[PDB]
Amino acid sequence: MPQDIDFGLPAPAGISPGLEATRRHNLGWVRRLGLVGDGPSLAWYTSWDMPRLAACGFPHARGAALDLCADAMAFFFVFDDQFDGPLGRDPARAARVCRRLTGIVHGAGPGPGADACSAAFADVWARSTDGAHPGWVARTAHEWEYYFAAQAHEAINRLRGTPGDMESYLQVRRGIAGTDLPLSLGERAAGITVPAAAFHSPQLRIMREAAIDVTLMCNDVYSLEKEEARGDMDNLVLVIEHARRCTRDEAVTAARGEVARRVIRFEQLAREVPALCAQLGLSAVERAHVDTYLGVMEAWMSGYHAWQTQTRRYTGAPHVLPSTGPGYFDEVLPT
Ligand SMILES: C[N+](C)(C)[C@]12C[C@H]3C[C@H](C[C@H](C3)C1)C2
Ligand SMILES: [Mg+2]
Ligand SMILES: [Mg+2]
Ligand SMILES: [Mg+2]
């Protein structure tokens, strides 16, 4: 059981003080945008506790920056679940819907009266880029493109009905998990700009990749029950079981080891970051932003796991949205 699985990550070093204020803003935001309705959808959304995910996952965010984190997560989760139904078995249709969203990334604003997912994403994206450094905008725009474009490949895999090999699983799963977007968001919400010289060091590139893998793999373990019965194939536990011809328990144990090896690698490289900044001759302010970036990555890993142990999303989904029907109460994404 997930209640008996722990990945060795520390508890969150801090929780953003803006949790309760953001809870109020974000509840109004999802309702105003039409992303979440009234009744079952609202009770189901509330049970996820998106504000606590934002406050635990992004403890550096304050005020309106935490609101952006919660709203961004709300979009990610509501959009994700729209594919838990016929859309997720229709790759060509999924690719067309995701092309609509990708157009918003690259300038084509949806216009008045767009669907709730398009309108919500356009609002998150506009708030994200306002005052952001152009290097951040360019990188994050390509991250969003990968996220949207990957969804149809998860649908292809569902039709195939076998997990991919490890390399192909990582290519699809890193995309559908939102790639580096949670870290780009945390950087933006902390108000920092990572100097490119540090950002592209081998240490920080490996650490960034490791942190994103850690959260999606921790999710794969905790979300397997609601995913397996829907025919989902891009889950690390299923990938290992398929590749190794092992038992479920052996696959879960191996999945935990894949998380642990990445945590160990992250922390080994983190010890080199002060010296790296000195070799590059970064200014004191630049080193401060790098130090915050390190904490943003550490907090995303520990904060995501802290959230997923207390949310009702993973324990609740199989009972309120059984696999015999769609994984949502309301369609909000026109296809
Ligand atoms: C993109 N969604 C919302 C599915 C996730 C965002 C964050 C990173 C992945 C795992 C969970 C936390 C869920 C993906
Ligand atoms: Mg998904
Ligand atoms: Mg999902
Ligand atoms: Mg999952």
DSSP string, 293-318: HHHHHHHHHHHHHHHHHH-SHHHHHH
Task: Report H helices in 231-331.
Answer: 236-244, 248-270, 273-279, 284-310, 313-320
Tell me the C-alpha to C-alpha distance, in Å, between residue 193 and each of 25, 105, 289.
26, 21, 7
Q: Specify the residue with its C-alpha closest to ligand 1, atom 5.
A: 177
Looking up tokens 């935490």 gives 66
For the chain, how are helix, strand and coil distributed in percent, rounded to 5?
70, 0, 30
Ligand 1 closest atom vs CA 176: 1
CB 217 within 8 A of CB 236: yes
Q: Tell me the ligand closest to 177's alpha carbon.
A: 1
- List of domains in the chain: 17-320 (1.10.600.10)
Q: Specify the residue with its C-alpha closest to ligand 1, atom 7.
A: 177
* Distance (Å, whole) CA 317 – CA 328: 9
* Distance (Å, whole) CA 191 – CA 304: 20
What length does the chain have?
Answer: 335
CB atoms within 10 A of CB 261: 13
Q: What is the dihedral of CA 77, 87, 121, 140, to 10 degrees?
A: 80
CB 166 within 8 A of CB 243: yes
* Distance (Å, whole) CA 203 – CA 217: 21
Q: Specify the residue with its C-alpha closest to ligand 1, atom 8.
A: 177
Q: How far is the CA of 271 from the centre of ligand 3 (A)?
A: 34
Ligand 1: which residues within 6 Å by Cβ? 76-77, 80, 177-178, 182, 215-216, 219, 304
Encoded tokens for 255: 């999945």
Tell me the C-alpha to C-alpha distance, in Å, between residue 109 and each of 47, 106, 115, 139, 176.
31, 9, 12, 19, 23
Q: What is the dihedral of CA 73, 76, 81, 82, to 10 degrees?
A: 130
* Distance (Å, whole) CA 144 – CA 101: 9
Stated in angstroms to one decimal place, the resolution of this structure is 1.4
Q: Give the residue, out of 78, 154, 215, with the most ligand 1 atoms within 8 A of its beta carbon, to mutate for a pocket test.
A: 215
Residue 2: Cβ-neighbour burial (10 angstroms; 0-12, 13-18, 19+): middle
Q: How far is the CA of 236 from the centre of ligand 4 (A)?
A: 10
Looking up tokens 């450094």 gives 133
Encoded tokens for 63: 């005020």
* Distance (Å, whole) CA 320 – CA 304: 23
Who contacts 276 (Cβ-Cβ below 8 Å, separation ≥6)?
198, 201, 203, 204
Who contacts 316 (Cβ-Cβ below 8 Å, separation ≥6)?
44, 47
Who contacts 82 (Cβ-Cβ below 8 Å, separation ≥6)?
117, 328, 331, 332, 333
